[PDB]
Every structure is written in C-alpha cells, then in structure tokens.
C-alpha cells in the first residue's frame, strides 16, 4: 500500500500499545500483530493489524532484528511518528 505517517502521543508511564512480530531474522518486516484498546496506538487511530512499521521517529526499521526494533520502539517518548505501510 501507500506509506502513511501516523503520530502517536503517549504519556511517560505507558507503552505504545502494540504487539509486533517479524524482523530481519524472520525474513519479513516488523509487523503489528495486535493493537491494544485504550493504549496510544489505538487512541491515534490510523494503525492496523497487518501494518509494517518501516520507521519510527526517523529510525529505519526495515533491516533490524526483532529485538533491536523492540528496543528502539521501547525508547521512544512523547510524540512518536510511525511510518507504516499495509502489507
């Protein structure tokens, strides 16, 4: 699909509100597998189960291992831009 950029806003105590699968070692992009109700991704709208996360706040995730992506995603704070495409 077309690339979309979605702005999440999260408070300092919460997670992003997604589950992710995939990554370089699995031969597929980082993929959103769940969007958790009431958490930041859900509140933003515009994200979907099945979206690939190509980048977060300008960090390219297209060639990162799963745990590297988890770590980068976990470090984001406040206003967070996701670059996604529905695969």
């Amino acid at each position: 699909g077309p690339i979309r950029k979605v702005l999440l806003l999260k408070e300092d105590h919460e997670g992003l509100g997604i589950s992710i699968t995939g990554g370089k070692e699995h031969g597929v992009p980082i993929l959103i597998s769940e969007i958790h109700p009431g958490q930041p991704a859900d509140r933003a709208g515009g994200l979907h189960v099945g979206d690939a996360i190509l980048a977060v706040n300008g960090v390219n995730l297209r060639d990162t291992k799963h745990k590297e992506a988890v770590t980068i995603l976990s470090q984001q704070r406040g206003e967070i831009e996701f670059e996604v495409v529905y695969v």
Partner: peptide, 6 residues
C-alpha cells in the same frame, strides 16, 4: 512465534 508487546 516471536511476538513482543511494546
């Protein structure tokens, strides 16, 4: 399956 909540 590898899956992580973040």
């Amino acid at each position: 399956r590898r899956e992580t909540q973040v």
